[PDB]
Amino acid sequence: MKTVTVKNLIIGEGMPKIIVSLMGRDINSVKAEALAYREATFDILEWRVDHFMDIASTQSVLTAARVIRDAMPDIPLLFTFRSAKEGGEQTITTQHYLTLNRAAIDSGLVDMIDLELFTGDADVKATVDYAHAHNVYVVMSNHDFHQTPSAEEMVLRLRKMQALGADIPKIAVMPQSKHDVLTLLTATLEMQQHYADRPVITMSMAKEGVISRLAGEVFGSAATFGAVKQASAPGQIAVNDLRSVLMILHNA
Amino acid sequence: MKTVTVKNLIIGEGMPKIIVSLMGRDINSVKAEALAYREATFDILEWRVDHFMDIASTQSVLTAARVIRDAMPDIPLLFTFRSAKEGGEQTITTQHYLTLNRAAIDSGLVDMIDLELFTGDADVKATVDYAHAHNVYVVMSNHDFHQTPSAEEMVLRLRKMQALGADIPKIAVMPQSKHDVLTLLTATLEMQQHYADRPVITMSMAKEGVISRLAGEVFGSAATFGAVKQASAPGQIAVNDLRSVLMILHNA
Numbered sequence A, B: 001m002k003t004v005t006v007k008n009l010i011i012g013e014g015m016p017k018i019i020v021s022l023m024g025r026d027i028n029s030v031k032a033e034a035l036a037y038r039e040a041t042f043d044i045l046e047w048r049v050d051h052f053m054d055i056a057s058t059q060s061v062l063t064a065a066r067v068i069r070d071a072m073p074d075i076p077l078l079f080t081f082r083s084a085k086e087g088g089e090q091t092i093t094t095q096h097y098l099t100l101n102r103a104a105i106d107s108g109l110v111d112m113i114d115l116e117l118f119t120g121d122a123d124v125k126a127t128v129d130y131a132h133a134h135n136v137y138v139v140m141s142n143h144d145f146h147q148t149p150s151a152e153e154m155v156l157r158l159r160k161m162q163a164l165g166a167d168i169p170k171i172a173v174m175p176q177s178k179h180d181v182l183t184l185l186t187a188t189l190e191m192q193q194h195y196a197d198r199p200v201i202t203m204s205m206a207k208e209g210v211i212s213r214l215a216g217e218v219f220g221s222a223a224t225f226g227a228v229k230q231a232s233a234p235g236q237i238a239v240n241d242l243r244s245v246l247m248i249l250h251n252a
């Protein structure tokens, strides 16, 4: 295992780390959300950049990143543009997606970026190497909002992310049955037992999958997402309730 | 599904029911424990009769049952002699085991008895029919403190309990790996999806199995055990923490 340490938070040891997602449509709402979020308790702040409407302007995006960093100078900050293709709010070109992520890297304002695996291998690898050259970590990600692949497919997908240089592979899948939730846990455990080179983040979405957001410590998900007021994906529970459960499991 | 209702508690619907176990070595300690336990919040009281030292006297056992019922007139009360063979505190003959359970049935003091499947089919069936003739329900049980059978074996074991007339089949197994915890959840889900005639109670014991004590609602365990001060089996957590988690999952 190679853990990832950002600002004295160690990802891949101990209790799963709690991530919350800031969603602001405009600069004023980003400000208001940042000031509210700093009164919540969590480990990592994700900025969901795809919720921001003025996406075409790299400088508008950077101004908003600074509002967030100014509000929370000491928080681990993860910059995430989630494509509509993978369940996010809007669509941009691949070149603009890469430009935004590289601008985030260059700014020094963010600790981590999210890179979607299915952007394409060559672009992903080049952007991972750019991030690493500038001391930014990569959460490499994949989301299936329709269905759950087999455990074997999910393991191979997470292993491919590792091979492309991901610091933290991540997969979120949609259960169509309770059995699909167990499939996601099975894949998570296989990574823990047999492919334990990088911390991985896994989740089964929606109501049936909520147990997967709670059981990260035993089966090997390094982080989990909670909701401050609105979920950033189906199945997230209130962040304080998430924290309560994680502590009970850590101390059991 | 045929649910089991005891004193306005419905087992096999809604949130898993919380069971705690009263362990007293003698009549004075049974008294003290009953008075403490009635200041805890839970759904079913199990009296672990095998912890009681004066086991040879049916009348001493009945006196202790009455102390408990007097302290808690409205609680669902489950009478359980757990054999040392199945992880309990002492050994008695099969005939004395049956005598104690029948005396409990006859007393009107208890709502449910525990009957261990591996006592033997004919004795178990006869005692189930005696319980049913006297309006007492049967939790039919099996415990493996060493290892976890396959999911297929556990399903067939729980189905056999159903066939012998169990109102609530129950299995507790010891994981030797994290994979074994998933095996127990898999068997539980198979009962929910394909053999949903009776409520079943399932648990993977010890620290690795604790998630199985929390995830009953999603995968189909009808009840779960918590600890008031001391666990009655490995892996039980503090009852208030158990209750907190169950409510979070019920409301997620």
Ligand SMILES: *C[C@H]1C[C@@H](C(=O)O)C[C@@H](O)[C@@H]1O
Pocket (backbone or CB within 6 Å): A021, A046, A048, A080, A082, A141, A170, A172, A203, A205, A225, A232, A233, A234, A236
């Ligand atoms: C990494 C994904 C995970 C989503 C989830 O399923 O909780 C939340 C979303 O904001 C993140 O980008």
Ligand SMILES: *C[C@H]1C[C@@H](C(=O)O)C[C@@H](O)[C@@H]1O
Pocket (backbone or CB within 6 Å): B021, B046, B048, B080, B082, B141, B170, B172, B203, B205, B225, B232, B233, B234, B236
């Ligand atoms: C039915 C068993 C279950 C045990 C457990 O694993 O929690 C506790 C014990 O007192 C019960 O009789």
